[PDB]
Amino acid sequence: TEDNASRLEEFSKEWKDASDKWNA
Amino acid sequence: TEDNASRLEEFSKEWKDASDKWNA
Secondary structure, three states: OOHHHHHHHHHHHHHHHHHHHHOO | OHHHHHHHHHHHHHHHHHHHOOOO
């Protein structure tokens, strides 16, 4: 569970970067 | 674990919105 949570906390940065890129 | 699951259930809506936007 904690490993999966760490994976998602890592992936959220990538998703935020993608959303910021696509907002422009 | 339950807080992380709630976070992912919230984020899935945003990902679905992004996929729907990019399908057009």
